[PDB]
């Protein structure tokens, strides 16, 4: 498993059961009620999936698609973003936006 | 600037840091960009004064001196867009991009 960083979610990492990203006063929470909520910015944001499934988790894949799956791997929500096979990162930015960047195009070490 | 990232359009100023755990990326006053404990450096020591790190709209990392002259470039480029140089917790600086999705909690509509 990849070590956790408070404001990042790399491809393959999972959030569930009120696990979250934090940056300044902003939070991105994969709540226990199957709702993904951004507490921050001016108005916040939500996936609007309260009660849509049980024991849901959030996972960013290696094509830039961010998905909420329930305990039986039924899709509850998707970012519907899809790109090159590679490594991606979801950043809860200091300015409140949550953005998926990828694929990786340059690295210091292989 | 993020504590552990640099977005295209932002600047990592002279003697500035990006840090993730024991891994410390420093844009030094001797114009060398070093990733402490990550076994990497731009190898541009004494090549300029008041040097800064930037990230182009094509995802290229660039070191420029106080006069604005280029000292080093990552050479790897992609399409015009928004990029992010992130200090990974396993000790590598990685450029990701372009952005493929955004959650906007600011727009009222």
Swiss-Prot record, chain B:
Domain of life from the UniProt record: Eukaryota
Binding-site list for beta-D-mannose: 28-32, 36, 40-41
UniProt domain Bulb-type lectin: residue ranges: 3-108
Residue intervals passing through the bilayer: none
Disulfide feature: 31-51
Residue numbers covered by motif Carbohydrate-binding motif 1: 28-36
Protein known as: Mannose-specific lectin 2 chain 1
Covered residues, full protein: 24 to 132 of 261
